[PDB]
Design a protein around this ligand. Structure first.
Ligand SMILES: Nc1ncnc2c1ncn2[C@@H]1O[C@H](CSCC[C@H](N)C(=O)O)[C@@H](O)[C@H]1O
Ligand SMILES: Nc1ncnc2c1ncn2[C@@H]1O[C@H](CSCC[C@H](N)C(=O)O)[C@@H](O)[C@H]1O
Ligand SMILES: Nc1ncnc2c1ncn2[C@@H]1O[C@H](CSCC[C@H](N)C(=O)O)[C@@H](O)[C@H]1O
Ligand SMILES: [Zn+2]
Ligand SMILES: [Zn+2]
Ligand SMILES: [Zn+2]
Ligand SMILES: [Zn+2]
Ligand SMILES: [Zn+2]
Ligand SMILES: [Zn+2]
Ligand SMILES: [Zn+2]
Ligand SMILES: [Zn+2]
Ligand SMILES: [Zn+2]
Ligand SMILES: [Zn+2]
Ligand SMILES: [Zn+2]
Ligand SMILES: [Zn+2]
Lengths: 432, 127, 438, 407, 378, 24
């Protein structure tokens, strides 16, 4: 019963059946979900395997596999600027028409069907609302629908107190950086960054206002009561454990992925006891490109469904991630601000021209992003900081170079994204 | 009532029966089998109340113990308690600090705030 | 030996019983006929010894100590002063023959050992420290040269309504220290033609200064036509890459051969750009070279330039020991060095938050153990200065060299061979009355 | 490799010009004056310094073909000091010629015997005049030609005033009155006591000697009268060039002065190419290459910077010349060679050496010029060896007769 | 006048050429030899009256060398009659006769030589640098054949290049045979000078020239002109001087070069030429003072110069420095043409070794003056 | 007085052997 796609394509081309009933690339009947790009259905296995590898990218700056099904065997890349979309050789001729595979390979330059104005090439009719329809896929599709978060009661303006933060895997102190950018008065902050390179950043730049502690491995229960009531628990675990960029690909239950459980343990301890009514919150952040099996696990352990704020809508780089938590308003409409840097041309030094408008994701490892005086060059550390919204020269401490000033900026959060997330907290704690 | 994980052949049930004590209701996930480990919610625990590496089972056991733990101020008898000796020292410290109690001995490693039939029989003697 | 060729023992014996003075005797050479006096002590010096003192006094080792004897010129075995703020090393042969027999053995065993420059002065044998050697060490260097040239002519005062911007041709520009200091005083720069060939030094000038520095190619490929295509220059700054003139390099080639030839390109283009006869426009120039250079070079460079250098040490305005010669006709190049309110005369003023400095001054920039690893401490742990603090020491604005992916080594090299902002600020300061201000 | 171009040109697939003569690298910049073909820029620069350098025995110290001496065969023919490169032979004419050349006795180089198409090493039919074209004008920069001074009337001609830095034995003084010009002053700057004796006794003390050059200040040049010709030649055995350039600026007429001023430098040809451009760039001129072999009986090639009127005219011998060694010899002495490089005579069937009075007539100075101050055989040779040559200098100084007073 | 000044013994045999008095036969013999030689410093070796002394006073007058003795004064002196040291009024022209007036060869000079005779045919031995050849050409007398017997290679070159090889060297004198003289004969002039005990060492050569006379004189019945000559230094034993005069059978003459030159050159002559005993008369083109035998801007500290030999206060000053004579300045002393020794690549040593032991051109020119009336003049 | 003194006088009135042979 493993029917192929040619029969379905022939049936729909004669107005005998619909595209929804069939898996858009698997060909199997009994669809479970749609395709955000093309009109049709997607099978359970296809949906499971394409939730994961959509947002992964290669070093050269193009998608790692097909934009249609899930797979890369022979790929023909679109050469249009500000577009890296790649297609599948098998996908083209079986749905749009015979002979298009060799014809496309000869025309220079090649433009993908998304670039050109929409035309129903065979059965590949693009959506006119795919821009607003892709978001609904990732936001909420899983089986269980957890209850809506409780809305804490309002507090009078004169009955507000300074917040007592407790950060984990603090990195270069991004939360502390945004907290005074909003205006909230921080009465206490307890980071637990163990990297001595990053520790020097927090002490010098914030004047020893971070009561630094060691790894989040030896903090005992009595410690979390010796330090008093905590009104916020930040945390972002390292994401170099389970990603399909490294072959090992150890799960969340092995290797460096067990640091998530430390956040849960500390959240249990810092949580107010039963019968207490102080405002309490939490948060999390991890790479979206994680296994589906563990994507639900983090949701179930924390009993919340992740959101997806897409950095492109606010910054000049592509990196989306999951933000669990019970913040009051973590599902609104993303809006940019006046003091933003939407295009890369605003994140460059003097006498340099930006060839692109947006830049592919940046990782620990570092072609034609900028040309000065008719000569190509690569981005500076002074330029990698304006992209994320960090103040310039932030990492210029402890005798650094390109070797380390790029690793720290690679696995850090985004100033505009968190600035968006922590906006509602101006009502429960001290302002000005 | 008793809640047990990794019942297996329900040797603990046989030990409890041989102890002369009666159990009102026993709930297990693998006798009253309900479903798999990953098919339990807060509402399910409330209805059933009151009462693959090693880390995969340890996380589920820790979550179950945290969910079944009594709220602050209660004085009801709530206790909990296994891993082989030959295993990574980092994981040993992980599961030692996570449970808020250092291991002692027994060749197995036993935690607890209280397979081998005699060990279970000796442990269930003071119940 | 000859009557002049005595030994130090006879001179010491003669001066012991008030039969002669230390003046007639060469303090270590021993010969007669003194030509000059020893700057630190009282006595006389000979030509064979004096010309060995004009070079070897200021050179330093990597570990942070004098390379030779503080007394004669020479190091066989040296006793370093254990006390800090003083890296003077004394000569074993110099000690026992002037203060008394057996002082060497007790000096090597007395812990900590304090050099005779540090202890309160007393007539230790014949090592009588001068009571005014601080002002007399300058006289050893500033004016003892050969031909006594005429005083430079002073330009007439210019009205403030006729002042115009400053056009600068900075041969061997480096990182544009002249541009940075020029507008700090408020002088408007209407043109600045750098001549650097290293690419990194162009990135700083293009980025930090908004591309107002018209760079050109190598100085060697500059013809007489370029010097007139680029308008009349009102200042010709220059400083040679003194890698072939300092005695520090054992494999040096000296003047007239090698890298030292580049002085004549400064000398060539200076005449090519100097105003001709009948031109009365204010023209100034300035050459700069290290003190540690052979007197054969120092006389020829002064003979061609027809001027005598000054000696401005960077210890009276900053927190580093750097001394250089300054040729030029800058108005007021001999006035004494006075610090300013917004200076950093100690090493503590040039540190980040939560850093503790042990010393009060540091030696020159560009085996170096337990002293180079101990110039600063934080959290009770040994540390070394930062590239951010090496810009405060010289007076450069913070984060000046944060361009073009420069690591630690590049920011160290382009900084250590540059000038010093307080010194060049002292030199350039009188120019405010000749050019357009604000 | 060498066989790459040889195989191609043999089959008429390419020409000899395309490849470096021995380097094997393509893209040549300059052509070989000797043979047909071109030279790579890497091989081009290395050929200037070693071409005219010779050995003590009287043979070249490098290859006649490329630049290299590892194994060389010396030409047995007299009046020819060219040694050929061993690997240059078999790769050009054919394998096995290296052994044959060494075995046959006597062996003559390919230059001596009349030109034959020996492989590809075909001697150029016009090599004689194309060697100068390589030397006289090949450097990149092309400075403007000097201005020509207006003619000086004979009624307004004045005695000459000379400033001979590094004077030596007053070679310049001897030629200026021999040509008939009236000397008004000759401010030498010699500091060798032996050489001062010759210039004073033989000229009745007409030289106003001074002390070392490194003690002369701008005030002395102001006191000593205005100069009209600044001679200069540095001891080749580079510091003293900048002293000549220093003093020339003091004595060069200032802007607005319209009096005839001439200068001239001199240096050997066996100097690095880098130094050659530096001297010309500072002086703003291009040099000439005058050889003494066309006016005397000895070999020496020396560059001549200056603004002298006519430094480019062809070299022509004079009637009062001694082109052969037999014309510079005493009685009962027989010459063996025709020229002597930079067993020279027989005496009753015994090989002897040129006398100090025979090395005297070769250079053009009057006989017994160096018989003062009790010099020995060694001293009289060293003063003559490092001096100039009268026929060469008299050729350069000849056009000056129309500018200053004569007789 | 009845006692010897330096000895005191009576019965004198001769008078004194400086002061009035007598001389014994012991002192006159010691006065003949010990008079004229000199020391390296340039002073008289002994006293001028007694010619003896271990320590003696040294004179310091300008251009003077006569040094007196210590005991010679207080014995007899204690210008006017100082004690008994009253100078003779004509000692200048008196001591010249004491040496001269000490028979001779055939006393009849034939004067038979007449017009249209053959030119000179002169034979020499140990010629050196062709001294006789140079003077003979200067007078104008044509020479048909000039033979020499020199052996030192360094001096053979000078005669060749400077005279275009007209001199035909043969060999050392020890190799010349009787047939060689006959083959090269006849001959009209036999010049000879021994290199400078007579019966031992290199001095044995004197009789070789005498034997050469025996193979060159005209035979019996041949009244053709024939002459000879001889030269020797004055520093010789008394018995040696009496032997040469005995063999040559002549009274030898005393000629000193001071009257014609600017150096102390007094040597001993023989011969049979006319007019040898005539007093020396100076010429208008003669160099008599050292101030003219010197190069440019060189002033002399003296007027005459002492005897000069192979071995080197020096008589000239340069630019305020105490300085010596040049090689080209020694030639003009002897009358030689300038640059006469600038051959064969030789320096101070060889040229000094040649000029020192050579004759004097003006001195030999005087002896050959009367020969112009016998042979082909001009 | 060796034989040379008498031999030289003998010739006038009328290596030793080599010169004696040449003497006659
Ligand atoms: N064992 C450990 N204990 C505490 N921090 C650790 C740790 N192992 C790694 N880290 C830190 O965790 C960080 C994760 S990158 C995330 C940093 C943070 N989200 C920010 O504001 O940038 C790394 O910088 C690393 O230094
Ligand atoms: N041929 C050349 N022409 C122009 N500049 C050169 C040069 N060769 C080297 N340089 C540059 O000249 C510099 C001399 S270091 C002196 C620069 C100056 N004192 C300052 O720092 O402000 C070197 O850094 C070198 O990069
Ligand atoms: N330091 C110095 N100052 C002046 N002259 C020097 C000198 N050093 C060397 N000389 C002279 O410079 C001369 C250069 S060799 C040229 C000699 C001269 N031109 C001639 O025709 O004979 C040497 O003879 C040497 O005597
Ligand atoms: Zn499918
Ligand atoms: Zn596909
Ligand atoms: Zn596209
Ligand atoms: Zn001394
Ligand atoms: Zn010492
Ligand atoms: Zn000290
Ligand atoms: Zn080549
Ligand atoms: Zn070769
Ligand atoms: Zn040849
Ligand atoms: Zn007597
Ligand atoms: Zn006497
Ligand atoms: Zn006298």
């Amino acid at each position: 019963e493993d029917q192929s796609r040619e029969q379905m394509a022939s049936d729909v081309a004669n107005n005998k059946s619909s595209l929804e009933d069939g898996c858009l690339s698997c060909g199997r009947k009994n669809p479970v979900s749609f395709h955000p790009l093309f009109e049709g259905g997607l099978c359970q296995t296809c949906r499971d395997r394409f939730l994961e590898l959509f947002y992964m990218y290669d070093d050269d700056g193009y998608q790692s596999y097909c934009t249609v099904c899930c797979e890369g065997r022979e790929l023909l890349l679109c050469s249009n600027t500000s577009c890296c979309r790649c297609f599948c050789v098998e996908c083209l001729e079986v749905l749009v028409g015979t002979g298009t595979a060799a014809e496309a390979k000869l025309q220079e330059p090649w433009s993908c069907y998304m670039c050109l104005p929409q035309r129903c090439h065979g059965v590949l009719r693009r959506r006119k609302d795919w821009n607003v329809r892709l978001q609904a896929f990732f936001t909420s599709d899983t089986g269980l629908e957890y209850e809506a978060p409780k809305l804490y009661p309002a507090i009078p303006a004169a009955r507000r107190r300074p917040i007592r933060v407790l950060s984990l895997f603090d990195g270069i102190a991004t939360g502390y950086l945004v907290l005074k950018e909003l205006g909230i008065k921080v009465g206490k902050y307890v980071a637990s960054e163990v990297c001595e390179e990053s520790i020097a950043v927090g002490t010098v730049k914030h004047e020893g206002n971070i009561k630094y502690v060691n790894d989040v491995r030896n903090i005992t229960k009595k410690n979390i009561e010796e330090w008093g009531p905590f009104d916020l628990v930040i945390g972002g675990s390292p994401c170099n454990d389970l990603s399909n960029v490294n072959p090992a690909r150890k799960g969340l239950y092995e290797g460096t992925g067990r640091l998530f459980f430390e956040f849960y343990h500390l959240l249990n301890y810092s949580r107010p006891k039963e019968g207490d009514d102080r405002p309490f919150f939490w948060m999390f952040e991890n790479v979206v490109a994680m296994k589906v099996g563990d994507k639900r696990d983090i949701s179930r352990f924390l009993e919340c469904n992740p959101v997806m704020i897409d950095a492109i809508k606010v910054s000049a780089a592509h990196r989306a991630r999951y933000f669990w938590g019970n913040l009051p308003g973590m599902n609104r409409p993303v809006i940019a601000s006046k003091n933003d840097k939407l295009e890369l041309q605003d994140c460059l030094e003097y006498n340099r021209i930006a060839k692109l408008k947006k830049v592919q994701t940046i990782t620990t490892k570092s072609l034609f992003p900028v040309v000065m005086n008719g000569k190509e060059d690569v981005l500076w550390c002074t330029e990698l900081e304006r992209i994320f919204g960090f103040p310039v020269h932030y990492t210029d401490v402890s005798n650094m170079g390109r070797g380390a000033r790029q690793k720290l900026l690679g696995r850090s959060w985004s100033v505009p994204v968190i600035r968006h997330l922590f906006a509602p907290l101006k009502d429960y704690f001290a302002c000005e």
